[PDB]
Amino acid sequence: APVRLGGAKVPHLMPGDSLNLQTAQDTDNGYSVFEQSLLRYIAAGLGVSYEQLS
Amino acid sequence: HGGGSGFGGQLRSWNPPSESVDAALLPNFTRGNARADDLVRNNGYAANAIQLHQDHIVGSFFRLSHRPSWRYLGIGEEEARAFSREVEAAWKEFAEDDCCCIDVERKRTFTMMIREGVAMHAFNGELFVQATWDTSSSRLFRTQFRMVSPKRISNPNNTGDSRNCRAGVQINDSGAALGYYVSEDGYPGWMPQKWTWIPRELPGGRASFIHVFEPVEDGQTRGANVFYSVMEQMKMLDTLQNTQLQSAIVKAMYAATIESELDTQSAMDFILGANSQEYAAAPVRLGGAKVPHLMPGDSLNLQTAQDTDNGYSVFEQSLLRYIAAGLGVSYEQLSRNYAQMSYSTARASANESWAYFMGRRKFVASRQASQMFLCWLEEAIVRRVVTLPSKARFSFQEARSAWGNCDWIGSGRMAIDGLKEVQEAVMLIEAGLSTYEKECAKRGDDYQEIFAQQVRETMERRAAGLKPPAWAA
Amino acid sequence: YHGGGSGFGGQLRSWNPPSESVDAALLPNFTRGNARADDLVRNNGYAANAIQLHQDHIVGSFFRLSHRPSWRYLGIGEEEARAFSREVEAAWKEFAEDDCCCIDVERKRTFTMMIREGVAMHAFNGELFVQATWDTSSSRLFRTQFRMVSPKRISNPNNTGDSRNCRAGVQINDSGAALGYYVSEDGYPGWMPQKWTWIPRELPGGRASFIHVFEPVEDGQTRGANVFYSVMEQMKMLDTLQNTQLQSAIVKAMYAATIESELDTQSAMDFILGANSQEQYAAAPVRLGGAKVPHLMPGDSLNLQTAQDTDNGYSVFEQSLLRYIAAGLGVSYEQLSRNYAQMSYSTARASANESWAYFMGRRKFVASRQASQMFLCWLEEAIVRRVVTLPSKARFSFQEARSAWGNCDWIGSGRMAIDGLKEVQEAVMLIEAGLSTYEKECAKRGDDYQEIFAQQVRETMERRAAGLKPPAWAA
Amino acid sequence: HGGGSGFGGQLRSWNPPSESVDAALLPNFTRGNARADDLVRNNGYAANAIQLHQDHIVGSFFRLSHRPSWRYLGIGEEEARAFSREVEAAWKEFAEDDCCCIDVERKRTFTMMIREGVAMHAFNGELFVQATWDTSSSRLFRTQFRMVSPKRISNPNNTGDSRNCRAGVQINDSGAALGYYVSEDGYPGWMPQKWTWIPRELPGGRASFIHVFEPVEDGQTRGANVFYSVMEQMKMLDTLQNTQLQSAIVKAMYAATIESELDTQSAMDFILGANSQEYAAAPVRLGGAKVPHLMPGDSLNLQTAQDTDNGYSVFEQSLLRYIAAGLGVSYEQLSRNYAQMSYSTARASANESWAYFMGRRKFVASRQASQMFLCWLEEAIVRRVVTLPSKARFSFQEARSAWGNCDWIGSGRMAIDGLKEVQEAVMLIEAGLSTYEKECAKRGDDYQEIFAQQVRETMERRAAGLKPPAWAA
Amino acid sequence: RGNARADDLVRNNGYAANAIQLHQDHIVGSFFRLSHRPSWRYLGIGEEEARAF
């Protein structure tokens, strides 16, 4: 079943129910910084300056 | 390689059905433009977006300069510029007339015609202007121009689409348009909608109906509004904005809470002050610190709530930037956010957007206005309003584009600094590289009357006998 | 395309807005929209400030006419027209900014106020209605007077429906041009009925009986739309959020502490708070002394709740919304929000010019038209009374050359400089380079070169008569 | 679309009762001014805001310069100059009269009456002043004045408001005011308040009573205070400041707690030193460490309390900006917070507020002063204070506006820097762009007497013989 | 298939639409003026005819 997007719609879940919201995690937990190291390394291979490449 | 399947399957089931843009958008073209009206008339950003277009590619005024092909006609520039003078004044008199006589609706002036058209073109993909010939002989010029909403053009009687008629647009084998089936107004839904076929061009040669747009690829008919790339995101952004604001309300609203086995009315009396001593449960005065004496067993709680903006502003940043890319307009102009910007960088943002705007001005504003202009010339010359030189190698209809070759002046690029901007402009003509004509066109005026006005001032000041201005002898 | 139809996996499958003209999309509940807009500008601080920004910047304080007839097109030497225009300007000057206050029928405002009134109501109601009339009493030299009319006044008679020609009290021909208007009289007492009245748009002689000005978005639109109509819901939602959050902090900071005694309230507060020694429900107020360390038995506790932050991200969230607000109203954000912090000179200069340019386009498309509309109507009577004589050798008469005779432009409050010294440096050097004229410079400063020159020569000989020193303009 | 119902209902029950401005203002008109007086009399921000007006709208003085329409009246140039200075001298002598007898109350001078005018128009939305002619001719001018509070102007006997009698304002058919019903002071509530009908205009061509206010739209009869968009929120702000202050007291007031089965009095002696040797419980001397010897079952818990400004400060200026938005005043002036302000940022905010003040001066301060001016001038001519030119095309009553045309000079813009302001001023005038009158008026002075004073200066110096000043030859 | 996917991105994505818009506005700009420079030396023609022509 689909659900229509609307207001807050606070529910009245019975005892023994739960409405856990998954907080997930930082989508870029260092990945950008890790690319910085890799991009510099690959820049050395191609000789072209890293900032031009990235 | 990349187009085949994608790494690890991934896009195993993404098979866009390659087809012409005509087949791409015509089935939902009316449906698409309907959503365009909604966003432009209900979201602030869209309203700002179109507003920014009107005030840049058009601006407050839209001046005209006529450049007939005297060399291509073999006419001396002396009489050529002599001839081009009065018509400009004649057009100027006919252009900014207060009566709004140039439109049948009699509720708009020439400048806003372009402004609405480019706006109409912006948020709908195209614009339509229809030429008329009113019978009111009192006016020297007996023609008027009115725009038409694109939704007013469609197949008569909702006819299924065919090769030569598409959305009520008559097209020949080659691809040119010939006629338009346009419906009338439909504000009262009680009466049925009739239809009217209008030829694109009068067989005589005078323009009857002008449709201006930009075809992305060849053989198409209707221009698609710019929002077709950002419609999905922008609408959901608004919904998120409203929902996020609503959540803050309710979460902040329920501030405290109290629990007890005691009576509900009694609890407020002994905890939250209450006024039951004298439907709505109990109003409570706001006074001092008002420390209670909750009995052991019950308690009072103050909800800590939650951060009202848990990075939501950052999410707006990215989403607005995405929207700005689709719209072409710079981000800081769209969101009116100018944080942590250097002068050099601030120039670049406006620098590229201005280049984008000037492209649209030539390709939309200039074309439609010039297409409007020569039609007015046609009436003027046939009504003997102005006189052509005797040396004319060709007839007016023969060299109509050559005769009516004209360029337009819009509102100038207001400088972020100006002082350097004027300084560089001054030293440029000092270097002799530039000319008065283009620099004043950049600012928003024409050198000719500027020279006359300066001539006007210097004689007046010398007549006034105070001091000659900075142009003497 | 693809985004038009159904989007990403159903997504906006329920978004199928109807397609129709703006009149069909605005007229049905058009009255309610004005009511919503009216309340916001009446009660929300930002909205009142927003419209105030329009009034004080689109026109500002003064509004000066400049009549520049097309002498070449009129078959008249500019020397006659220049002399002629000077006469009419003073007569207009004698008529427009006069302390007579008789420009309006109710005699309450002055000319500059009329435009300021008009632009404001046009801003938050979409359009302006001004009535042009005549005075039977020849007491005044000019019998014409004006009267602004609320757009709410303009309405269909007997609150009936609308036809192909009848639309919200406006009668239109096939082309949609307005010809007839219906105005109901004021109904301030809540009992007596309102009475309508049909008014022609213009008199057959070319006189504008009733002037209506707005900015339609598409052909056929009869009534303009208020600028708020895109962002009104945010204001109300922002309004309640501000009040609720402010209210919430009151209660969160209300109850500072609590006591967990087993005894009665009186005994508890006496032994934990103090008070007592009563002089003669009301519980007991406690003197605010110092420290007052109490003693406790087991089973009783004095707990001071820490509450929570009163601005836990509220301001920044509002900071975002106000940015969205300024986009809808087309005004510089920091100006609307009065939040002029953390921006450099370039950044500050960027926003200010951007909005100011929007005002200038708005000023030309509204203020210039409305002032000119009134000016020609007054001019009609002015020459009818022949207070100023038209040039004898005119190629055309006045009636056909209405715009040519009445060709005029207007100047309001100038672009007040952010820096000043830089800006004055601009004008002086470009004039030294000869890239502009005194007219533009004076107009950009909200002035006219004529009297400035007249004052300049006047101040010259005055000191010269005083024998003090020749100013920087001699011989 | 947006105005219909709202997304997800939302504003499904927001239905303002569309009405005329008076139809909403009049029913609660007294209550509006009631709360306005309370806020200005009790709230510092309200007091500061109002105080910010009379010293900026008009400053500490109000110069007058009468400019008759000599060209329109066809009068000689210098003759008009001769007339203007005589009446100016006559006016200025009477305007700042140290008698304080200009007003019947004899408790205010002309300048502060103008300040009284603008301030009253600020927090009450309107301005009143009664023109009277005194019988006692002890002095040259019999025309006194008295501003009347709006609270003294209302419908007589609290009768039902009518079509032509709204809020004690006699209204003609066209909507213009004809007369007013003024109630005398009712300082003791024991006695009733009678009513006097005052004509708006004396039949002789004299403004018997002068009412100044700004109408939002047509049909207005009274003026709405600027606070109308700011009352409730700032009142809730007012109690919040008090409420947190009291809460901060008690939270910081209670410091330590003692629990022990021992008798409380002995607990104080054994633990907190006490003075048991010599009801106010038991005081404690303030000395050194006072390390105790708590037995098992006892403790000396110290209350860490809680931060006294947990976001309250940063919550303030967010509201105060909203407050300052309502009153139009710049935020930093109202809040007296001036941090994080660069030179350009300071320039902009002061500039923005300044223009609005200049507008407010023109529409209120100049209006009231002009109305006071010609009324006095009317007495001046009838008393032959100044002799009119013979060749007057029309008499004074016919050309009151022409005779009485004038401007006013308030206090100047307090320059933040001054140097460049003077530096731009000197380069502006030398360029010929401006005139000496302009800037000195912007400074707040008149060019005429400065020329005379400098002329006085140079001859005084020459007589003393020290050095020719910078005006010689 | 490749053009089909390539078409869709420029047809329904803001960034892609921005890219091609940047292409047109920068690669060619608003005006595309032409000059004719025949090689009169190779043509063995007097330059005066060539530039006049």
Tab-separated table of C-alpha atoms in Angstrom, chain C residues 17 74 90 116 164 205 229 280 334 348 404:
chain	number	residue	atom	x	y	z
C	17	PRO	CA	-3.133	20.118	-11.477
C	74	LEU	CA	4.224	67.540	-33.290
C	90	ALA	CA	4.981	75.196	-12.786
C	116	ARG	CA	2.538	55.673	-2.656
C	164	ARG	CA	-18.130	35.843	-20.849
C	205	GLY	CA	-13.840	62.225	-25.603
C	229	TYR	CA	-0.207	34.932	-3.381
C	280	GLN	CA	-4.203	37.561	57.175
C	334	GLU	CA	18.899	41.251	4.673
C	348	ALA	CA	26.530	43.805	0.289
C	404	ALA	CA	2.787	63.281	-27.999
